[PDB]
Design a protein around this motif. Structure first.
Motif, PDB file in Angstrom:
ATOM      1  N   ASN A  62       0.828  -1.201   0.000  1.00 33.33           N
ATOM      2  CA  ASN A  62       0.000   0.000   0.000  1.00 33.33           C
ATOM      3  C   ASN A  62       0.867   1.256   0.000  1.00 33.33           C
ATOM      4  N   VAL A  63       0.680   2.101  -1.009  1.00 33.83           N
ATOM      5  CA  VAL A  63       1.445   3.337  -1.120  1.00 33.83           C
ATOM      6  C   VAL A  63       0.568   4.549  -0.830  1.00 33.83           C
ATOM      7  N   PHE A  64       1.107   5.501  -0.075  1.00 33.84           N
ATOM      8  CA  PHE A  64       0.364   6.707   0.273  1.00 33.84           C
ATOM      9  C   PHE A  64       1.141   7.957  -0.121  1.00 33.84           C
ATOM     10  N   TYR A  65       0.454   8.890  -0.772  1.00 33.81           N
ATOM     11  CA  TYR A  65       1.074  10.136  -1.204  1.00 33.81           C
ATOM     12  C   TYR A  65       0.927  11.211  -0.132  1.00 33.81           C
ATOM     13  N   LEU A 104      -3.004  12.539  -0.633  1.00 31.31           N
ATOM     14  CA  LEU A 104      -3.971  12.141   0.386  1.00 31.31           C
ATOM     15  C   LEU A 104      -4.816  10.969  -0.099  1.00 31.31           C
ATOM     16  N   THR A 105      -4.199  10.087  -0.879  1.00 27.74           N
ATOM     17  CA  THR A 105      -4.893   8.920  -1.411  1.00 27.74           C
ATOM     18  C   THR A 105      -3.945   7.732  -1.529  1.00 27.74           C
ATOM     19  N   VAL A 106      -4.301   6.631  -0.876  1.00 26.81           N
ATOM     20  CA  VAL A 106      -3.479   5.426  -0.908  1.00 26.81           C
ATOM     21  C   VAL A 106      -4.067   4.382  -1.851  1.00 26.81           C
ATOM     22  N   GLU A 107      -3.228   3.861  -2.740  1.00 23.01           N
ATOM     23  CA  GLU A 107      -3.658   2.853  -3.700  1.00 23.01           C
ATOM     24  C   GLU A 107      -3.534   1.454  -3.106  1.00 23.01           C
ATOM     25  N   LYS A 139       0.912  12.787   7.775  1.00 22.27           N
ATOM     26  CA  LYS A 139       1.691  13.423   6.725  1.00 22.27           C
ATOM     27  C   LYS A 139       2.840  14.221   7.321  1.00 22.27           C
ATOM     28  N   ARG A 140       2.622  14.756   8.515  1.00 19.15           N
ATOM     29  CA  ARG A 140       3.650  15.537   9.192  1.00 19.15           C
ATOM     30  C   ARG A 140       4.660  14.621   9.865  1.00 19.15           C
TER      31      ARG A 140
END
Length: 116
Positions: free
Chosen positions: A12-15, A19-22, A39-40
């Protein structure tokens, strides 16, 4: 020290800017205020941080525009975020140790297109 600009936890990758994980099935969206906390912490990725001081990192990026505090926003984040929500470790003596992995992702090169 190396400031990463992406997330890669298992399948699972998160940007940090999307703000969206594939996911294997497709994708997964979430609130940017709750995902903003992770994110911080991703900016540090495995480091010794504080709680109250954390308010300054979540406050500089919307102190949850739909909650009462940040600690309560991290709990709901565990729902959308996933296994990364548990990453944030609250040591009763150290503070906040969001231990993830350590393998940062410093964008050294600018591209990659050549024979092998």
């Amino acid at each position: 020290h190396s400031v990463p600009e992406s997330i890669r936890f298992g399948p699972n990758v998160f940007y940090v800017l999307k703000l969206t994980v594939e996911t294997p099935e497709g994708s997964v969206h979430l609130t940017p205020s709750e995902s903003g906390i992770l994110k911080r912490l991703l900016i540090n990725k495995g480091q010794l941080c504080l709680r109250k001081h954390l308010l300054e990192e979540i406050k500089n990026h919307a102190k949850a525009i739909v909650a009462r505090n940040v600690d309560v926003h991290i709990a709901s984040l565990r729902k959308k975020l996933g296994a990364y929500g548990s990453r944030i470790v609250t040591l009763r003596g150290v503070g906040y140790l969001f231990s993830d992995d350590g393998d940062k992702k410093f964008s050294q090169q600018d591209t990659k297109l050549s024979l092998e």
